[PDB]
Amino acid sequence: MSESVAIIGAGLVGCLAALAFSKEGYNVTLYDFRQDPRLDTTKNKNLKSINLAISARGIDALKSIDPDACEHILQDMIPMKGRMIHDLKGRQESQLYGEAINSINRSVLNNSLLDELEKSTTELKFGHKLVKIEWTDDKQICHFAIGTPHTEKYDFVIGCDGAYSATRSQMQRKVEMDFSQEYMNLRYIELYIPPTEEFKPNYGGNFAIAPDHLHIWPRHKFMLIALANSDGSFTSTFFGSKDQISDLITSKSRVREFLIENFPDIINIMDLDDAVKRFITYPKESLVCVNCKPYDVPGGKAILLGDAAHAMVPFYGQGMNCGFEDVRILMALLKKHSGDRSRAFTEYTQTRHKDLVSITELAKRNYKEMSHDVTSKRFLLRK
Numbered sequence: 001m002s003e004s005v006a007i008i009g010a011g012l013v014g015c016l017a018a019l020a021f022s023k024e025g026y027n028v029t030l031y032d033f034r035q036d037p038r039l040d041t042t043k044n045k046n047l048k049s050i051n052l053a054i055s056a057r058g059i060d061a062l063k064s065i066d067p068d069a070c071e072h073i074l075q076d077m078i079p080m081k082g083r084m085i086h087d088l089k090g091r092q093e094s095q096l097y098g099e100a101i102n103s104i105n106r107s108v109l110n111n112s113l114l115d116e117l118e119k120s121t122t123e124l125k126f127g128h129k130l131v132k133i134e135w136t137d138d139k140q141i142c143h144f145a146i147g148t149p150h151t152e153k154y155d156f157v158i159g160c161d162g163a164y165s166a167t168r169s170q171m172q173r174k175v176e177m178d179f180s181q182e183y184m185n186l187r188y189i190e191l192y193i194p195p196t197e198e199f200k201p202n203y204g205g206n207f208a209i210a211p212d213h214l215h216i217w218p219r220h221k222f223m224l225i226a227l228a229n230s231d232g233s234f235t236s237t238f239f240g241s242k243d244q245i246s247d248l249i250t251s252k253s254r255v256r257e258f259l260i261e262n263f264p265d266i267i268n269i270m271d272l273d274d275a276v277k278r279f280i281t282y283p284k285e286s287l288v289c290v291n292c293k294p295y296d297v298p299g300g301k302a303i304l305l306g307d308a309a310h311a312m313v314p315f316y317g318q319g320m321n322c323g324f325e326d327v328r329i330l331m332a333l334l335k336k337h338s339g340d341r342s343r344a345f346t347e348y349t350q351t352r353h354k355d356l357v358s359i360t361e362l363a364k365r366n367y368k369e370m371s372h373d374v375t376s377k378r379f380l381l382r383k
């Protein structure tokens, strides 16, 4: 009487999808080739950033799925009041909220969703790599490499397997899928702002700068940002072109001078030497933007959510929030259609792809305002 679903990928979107479907009564199995990130034996946590901005929409998605869990899962998130813009003179200006965001730790959020899933009948299958799918009019046969071949049949499959989705490739054999991948001329580097030694009453913690603002140092086609952690430290991120970064890291002094010149007010709050070290040593992940149409295999046999459907630019886009909204939209469509996945998945493709156009255009406009159109003397250095 129950239907079974294989969800491929146990990142943030996959875990939320698993929560949503298990709650709605489906028999869920959640696969990931990675080891369980809650284990100390698992060395690669695959965490692209230490923390995340979760929007009202992202929060509302988790809340629509499980309000009690959502309360518990998000208890330590730090609400933001606005953005704090830092100019070349180290002047800060508060711009109060667009959409509200809250800072939350990535590891904690992903680990907490897994914890919630263990309280359901969801089967967790780490160490399982999806390698092939056979599509039929009844069940879909999913082939895995474990550790070792392994196959299991499912009524339908949800690809939440990220930007390079194996599920998406498998779908492409069954349906004509328009597809594009674009490798961004953009890299990011994670930096660190330590907690202060003493509790700062006006900040409510050991914070070196305002914890209730997303801090941005916007420059011409590059940017530094910072978002608070619960312990008083900030996760800081530098974004710049591949060419700019490659040219900088040829020399430690060159990086150091660049940082001092462009972000002079970070010397008060960050160790320059290890910043330089982090800058030269941080592994540079390639950022790819991918788009998809359709998102489903006809007859309700499969659907793609999260980065697997629409991997987008960091910061300027909001991949996790978008993926959380994917899930919320899908579940509402399933309820609207009384469990008819054929109808729901088809309508999903139509409406979500209209949404994606609007989302993409917003992100481009965000990049234009915040990073491209930056030439004033307060933001672009004159030698």
Ligand SMILES: Cc1cc2nc3c(=O)[nH]c(=O)nc-3n(C[C@H](O)[C@H](O)[C@H](O)COP(=O)(O)OP(=O)(O)OC[C@H]3O[C@@H](n4cnc5c(N)ncnc54)[C@H](O)[C@@H]3O)c2cc1C
Binding pocket: 008, 009, 010, 011, 012, 013, 014, 031, 032, 033, 034, 046, 048, 049, 051, 052, 053, 054, 128, 129, 130, 131, 160, 161, 162, 163, 164, 165, 166, 167, 188, 305, 306, 307, 308, 314, 315, 317, 318, 319, 320, 321, 322, 323
């Ligand atoms: C630096 C940075 C900062 C960001 N900040 C924000 C932010 O502040 N707010 C926000 O909303 N978004 C943010 N994002 C975007 C966000 O990180 C991603 O959109 C989000 O994590 C995507 O989640 P996902 O579950 O779709 O994909 P993923 O996190 O990529 O998870 C996919 C999972 O599938 C597994 N997998 C892949 N292939 C297979 C296979 N063949 N078989 C089995 N398993 C497989 C992988 O191991 C992986 O665990 C940021 C991104 C970056 C890089």
